[PDB]
Design a protein around this ligand. Structure first.
Ligand SMILES: *[C@@H]1O[C@H](CO)[C@@H](O[C@@H]2O[C@H](CO)[C@@H](O[C@@H]3O[C@H](CO)[C@@H](O)[C@H](O)[C@@H]3O)[C@H](O)[C@H]2NC(C)=O)[C@H](O)[C@H]1NC(C)=O
Ligand SMILES: O=c1ccn([C@@H]2O[C@H](COP(=O)(O)OP(=O)(O)O)[C@@H](O)[C@H]2O)c(=O)[nH]1
Lengths: 582, 585
């Protein structure tokens, strides 16, 4: 352990599992000194951390630490560089050689020979640097994170771009690029040889040497033609009309083009040799991207053409899923890094290689509930198991209930009935044996055959909520606020949990994923629990709920507005069908 | 004799491997060379390499190099002699692309957890890897082979309850481990059994080593030597779920194999709490882990050939990630692989109404009824394009003047032959996703019905949506499937006539369906809809949506035979029975 206490730290040597106990893994954020300049992206990161359930205020309870100093940019010439950081980090009382400290970094190195120069001595602290070389990466200690701009959304999402999965997935162009080329320095070798493979019909590549003083000082015999060619095609049009997108190395291994390529759904073809792709040890990038070697730059287009059409479809879809699940917002990146760190504490309680690389993703799949894939509703088709044939009825009570209880018990799929006597309806219970939970209100009349039909419909769609009472949502232009519809419309986006069926895992997700503030507001207002439940289901599944057949109101709008503010977008999708028995 | 430099741990694929040598080829397979001159194990390895598609001649064209030096065991390696041999190989080229095979990378006095030869840059496939001795993207973690896998043919016992819960059958445990094991045994009793010294002996009881592992639902593997013990292979062959207590050890083939669904890793410090956390794993997860353990043995640990093939496949996928094989093909058992679905349309995307559906009408010797349906189809909103396919060559298409006046771009395609499956060919004229296959005889549909069908398909772009309702039943008297349409309590199929489906289904029918079905269905001129339903349910693994509470739309033995043949060709029947239909809210 003491021998490998350097750049060779791993979690069995430069980490302390004792502080993480069993129900722990808390993250402590150092308080602000109120005397330092900090970039906006670092406020975004700490807002993500403190908004998460991993946040805590007591350093002793936490077994993970994150500094309050702006360490994202370590370039000396950058405006956001912080001076005298080496001596400043040693003045912290809780540093403890960075035993349980997580450092976020996006840039490192100066103009000559950009390297792993974080400035201050990290010591035992793992670093979540963006552009990490393969030889400089700790296999199971550090985390490779995406490089994002200051304009990257904090909590919301851009919902991708690919609205149509047209067949064939090929588009007007095949392999495109529009970026700066560098006359002198390090990292322009892959960029200066793109004209060798430029075609103009499918492989269209664009470069410019316009990067400051060297615009006309040391220009080669090709800047004139390059600049003339550069001023025709839009970057948001050629990126959105391309099957494949290049992400080559510039000054640094990473680039902003990667996230934009996942945004535009075009399959990235990385040329940055030896780059730990974001969450490479956790996410399979052979499934969402084409990894190419810059040494064989000339032979790339033949390999791109040789890729089969079905492979292109799969890569495009996986790229969209990865962007929309992990790279959409800074909050998603921060929580992904935190959960990746958490998965390495208990090796028997963590996510497998299939959860991360499949819907809905690791952020919505908590292994603390169970590490068994069949304990989740998302993986029945990937494995060979049918959905469970039995369901558990959960009834919350504050007579019709006497007749209601008998009707629900007569169902052939009913295993047991749980009656709740007093937002406590959503907590997990060890008494529930079945994986399907039927939440039934005391005032909702629900017939036995109706229960059976609802359960059979849920058996075909285990990931969703199958329920009878459905409510819709709308947008108000007068007040710029989201609205709640309780009237019969030819559209709907939410189903109430009063007479609905959903998987048992949603209880654990509600209890241990949503933060305390939303549930506290629900308790104080004494409503809005089912709306947030539907919000969580629509966020995890990205699908509308399924409806089957055969003063208080003003609080719902505020509930929806604050839930939208926390989520950052609409998990809700409007739905317009109604499944009925044949 | 010259000796290369020591093992460079800062060696990765993008700086060490010479990608020029194996640049590109239509068959994305690495070519491996065998060096002319030894244990029987290495001889089996070399035979496995030479008898595979990776083996080639003409050394200057090959990509990988595997020297013919028995390096598998380091106990009798003669490190200096091995280094001198690799230097005298005369084709080392600083060891940029050479591959070495090992299973016991440890020394007598100290356990270096890696091959002790210089091996300055050679790619290493070893048995015992620590996280400090393992290069992530360069080295390959291979298992250590126990000859008991071939010496004894342990019966393939299925998953189920067992007499013992936890078992530890190893010889030579250090006292720090044996004391804790004894403490756990005396604490619980009758579930944990510890075996002491090819025969195992307990207190006044004797157990045969290969077969005793079958009676325990868990087996515990310690780190005693070289960090990798051959007991793991026996544990996996017997079916019991391994419990690796090694502190810093990466399980073999962890690059692609999901060891979390087959093994449990417990830190050596928390050895006294092994039983408590082992109670946490549920019984059905135990069954899955046993199945994964058996599959991992019957494919990667059974023989040296399996190990060599897996290692070469790892290197090939690293070199050619775009053509790399899937995760399921790596670590899915054949039974689950047959049961797996892997739906090609896996994004939960809802396309907007900006585009529409390309209606395809199949026509032959019926023109008076074709107008009555095309006029109604043209009235449907969000109809981007309409294609009329002309299967009849004897007749001439009617002149353009008499075609009905529509606001949708119409196109008539002249077929080369008269095949009823020509409606499912993916035409380049479809600029949309949804494709509406509508038949001539179908007249009793309103524009509202077609619009609602398209709207419902928007929510389910990955499956097939159709108006007519049919299903299938099992008859015990004939012991065969039958086609039933008179009564409808459940729905398992919808006819392609008046059906909304994604054009990838057309592509699948035209190209990826087995060739026995397309030709047969063309020859018999019937049951194209049944074949499309079968293919869609097989590829998507999802049900079918009927979007109308009506049965009559147009104004049995053959189809039963169609269903029976389609069930026979698939090896099972992919269709799923559901009783839910979609109607306006
Ligand atoms: C979708 O269609 C594929 C066929 O393309 C189905 O795969 C087939 O599954 C059956 C079992 O359901 C396999 O039969 C088995 O064959 C082995 C010998 O190979 C035999 O030992 C077993 O007893 C069994 O009969 C068949 O081999 C397999 N074929 C292929 C090409 O994979 C798949 O099951 C279908 N999926 C669904 C959900 O229906
Ligand atoms: O014509 C252009 C060129 C670049 N960019 C944006 O600028 C960034 C890429 O910058 P650059 O090409 O300079 O990266 P580098 O060349 O330094 O690696 C990305 O966010 C692109 O979307 C753009 O919008 N239009």
């Amino acid at each position: 352990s003491s021998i490998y206490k350097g750049k060779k730290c791993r979690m069995e040597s430069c980490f302390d599992f004792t502080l993480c106990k069993k129900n722990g893994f808390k993250v402590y954020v150092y308080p602000q000194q109120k005397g330092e300049k900090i970039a906006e992206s670092y406020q975004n990161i700490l807002a993500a951390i403190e908004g998460s359930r991993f946040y805590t205020s007591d350093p002793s309870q936490a077994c993970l630490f994150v500094l309050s100093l702006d360490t994202l940019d370590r370039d000396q010439l950058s405006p956001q560089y912080v001076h005298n950081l080496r001596s400043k980090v040693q003045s912290l009382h809780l540093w403890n050689n960075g035993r349980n400290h997580l450092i976020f970094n996006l840039y490192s190195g100066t103009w000559p020979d950009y390297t792993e120069d974080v400035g201050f001595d990290i010591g035992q602290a793992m670093l979540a640097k963006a552009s990490i070389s393969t030889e400089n990466f700790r296999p199971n200690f550090d985390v490779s994170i995406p490089l994002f701009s200051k304009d990257h959304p904090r909590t919301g999402g851009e919902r991708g771009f690919l609205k149509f999965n047209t067949i064939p997935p090929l588009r007007k162009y095949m392999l495109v690029f529009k970026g700066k080329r560098y006359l002198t320095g390090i990292g322009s070798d892959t960029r200066n040889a793109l004209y060798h493979v430029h075609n103009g019909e499918d492989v269209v590549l664009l470069t410019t040497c316009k990067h400051g003083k060297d615009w006309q000082k040391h220009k080669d015999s090709r800047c004139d033609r390059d600049n003339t060619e550069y001023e025709k095609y839009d970057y948001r049009e050629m990126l959105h009309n391309a099957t494949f997108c290049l992400v080559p190395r510039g000054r640094r291994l990473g680039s902003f083009r990667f996230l934009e390529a996942l945004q535009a759904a075009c399959v990235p073809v990385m040329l940055s040799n030896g780059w730990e792709l974001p969450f490479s040890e956790v996410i399979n990038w052979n499934q969402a991207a084409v990894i190419g070697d810059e040494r064989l730059l000339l032979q790339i287009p033949s390999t791109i053409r040789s890729i089969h059409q079905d492979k292109i479809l799969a890569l495009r879809q996986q790229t969209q899923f990865l962007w929309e699940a992990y790279f959409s917002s800074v909050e998603k990146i921060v929580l992904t890094t935190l959960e990746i760190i958490q998965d390495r504490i208990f090796k028997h309680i963590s996510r497998n290689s299939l959860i991360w690389n499949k819907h809905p993703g690791g952020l919505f799949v908590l292994p603390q509930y169970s590490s068994y894939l069949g304990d989740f509703p998302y993986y029945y088709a990937n494995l060979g198991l049918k959905p469970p044939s039995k369901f558990t009825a959960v009834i919350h009570a504050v007579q019709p209930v006497l007749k209601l209880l008998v009707a629900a018990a007569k169902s052939q799929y009913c295993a047991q009935i749980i009656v709740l006597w007093n937002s406590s309806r959503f907590l997990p219970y060890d008494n529930i044996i079945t994986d399907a939970v039927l939440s039934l209100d005391e005032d909702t009349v629900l017939s036995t055959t109706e229960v059976d039909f609802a359960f059979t419909v849920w058996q075909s769609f285990p990931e969703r909520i199958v329920g009878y009472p459905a409510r819709s949502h709308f947008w108000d232009n007068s007040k710029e606020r989201w609205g709640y519809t309780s009237k019969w419309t030819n559209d709907y986006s939410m189903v109430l949990t009063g007479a609905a069926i959903y998987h048992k895992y949603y209880h654990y997700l509600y209890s241990h994923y949503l933060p305390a503030s939303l549930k506290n507001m629900v308790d104080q207002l004494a409503n809005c629990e089912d709306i947030l439940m539907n919000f969580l289901v629509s966020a995890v599944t990205k699908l509308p709920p399924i409806k089957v057949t055969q003063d208080h109101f003003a609080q719902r709008q505020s509930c929806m507005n604050t839930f939208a503010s926390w989520f950052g977008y609409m998990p809700l999708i409007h739905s317009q069908m109604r499944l009925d028995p044949v | 004799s010259p000796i290369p430099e020591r093992g460079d741990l800062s060696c990765r694929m993008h700086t060490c491997f010479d990608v020029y040598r194996c640049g590109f080829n239509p068959k994305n397979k690495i070519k491996v060379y065998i060096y002319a001159l030894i244990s029987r194990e290495y001889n089996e390895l070399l035979m496995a390499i030479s008898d595979s598609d990776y083996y080639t001649d003409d050394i200057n064209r090959a990509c990988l190099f595997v020297p013919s030096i028995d390096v598998l065991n380091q106990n009798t390696l003669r490190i200096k002699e091995t280094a001198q041999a690799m230097a005298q190989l005369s084709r080392w080229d600083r060891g940029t692309n050479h591959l070495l095979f090992n299973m016991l990378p440890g020394g007598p006095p100290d356990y270096n957890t890696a091959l002790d030869v210089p091996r300055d840059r050679a790619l290493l496939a070893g048995g015992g890897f620590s996280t400090w001795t393992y290069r992530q993207g360069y080295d390959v973690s291979i298992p250590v082979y126990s000859p008991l896998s071939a010496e004894v043919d342990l019966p393939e016992k299925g998953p189920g309850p067992r007499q013992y819960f936890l078992l530890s059958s190893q010889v030579g445990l250090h006292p720090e481990y044996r004391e804790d094991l004894e403490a756990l045994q005396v604490k619980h009793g009758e579930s944990v059994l510890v075996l002491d010294k090819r025969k195992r002996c307990h207190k006044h009881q004797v157990f045969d080593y290969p077969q005793v592992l079958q009676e325990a639902t868990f087996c515990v593997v310690l780190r005693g030597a070289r960090l990798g013990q051959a007991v793991l292979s026996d544990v996996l062959q017997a079916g019991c779920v391994p419990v690796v207590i090694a502190d810093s050890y990466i399980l073999p083939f962890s690059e692609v194999l999901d060891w979390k669904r087959a093994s449990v890793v417990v830190p050596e410090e928390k050895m006294s709490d092994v039983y408590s956390i082992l109670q946490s794993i549920p019984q059905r997860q135990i069954e899955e882990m046993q199945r994964q353990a058996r599959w991992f043995w019957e494919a990667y640990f059974q023989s040296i050939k399996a190990i060599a093939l897996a290692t070469l496949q790892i290197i090939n996928d690293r070199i050619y990630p775009y053509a790399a094989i899937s995760y399921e093909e790596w670590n899915d058992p054949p039974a689950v692989k047959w049961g797996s679905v892997s739906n090609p349309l896996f994004l939960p995307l809802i396309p907007p109404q900006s585009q529409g559906f390309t209606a395809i009408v199949l026509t032959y010797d019926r023109v008076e009824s074709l107008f009555r349906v095309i006029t109604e189809v043209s009235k449907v909103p969000s109809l981007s394009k309409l294609l009329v396919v002309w299967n009849n060559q004897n007749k001439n298409p009617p002149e353009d003047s008499l075609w009905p006046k529509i606001r949708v771009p119409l196109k008539v395609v002249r077929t080369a032959e008269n095949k009823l499956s020509n409606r499912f060919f993916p035409y380049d004229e479809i600029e949309t996703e949804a494709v509406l296959a509508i038949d001539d005889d179908i007249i009793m549909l309103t524009s509202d019905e077609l619009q609602f069908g398209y709207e419902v398909w928007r929510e389910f772009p990955d499956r097939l949506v159709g108006y007519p309702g049919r299903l299938h039943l099992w008859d015990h008297e004939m012991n065969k499937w039958k086609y039933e349409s008179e009564w409808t309590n459940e729905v398992s199929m919808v006819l392609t006539g008046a059906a909304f489906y994604h054009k990838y289904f057309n592509y699948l029918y035209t190209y990826k369906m087995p060739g026995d079905i397309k030709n047969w269905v063309d020859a018999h001129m019937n049951c194209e809809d049944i074949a499309m339903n079968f293919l869609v349910a097989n590829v998507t693994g999802k049900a079918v949506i009927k979007v109308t509470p009506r049965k009559k739309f147009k104004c049995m033995v053959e189809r039963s035979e169609c269903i029976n043949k389609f069930a026979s060709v698939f090896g099972t029947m992919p269709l799923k029975v559901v009783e839910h239909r979609a109607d306006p809210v």
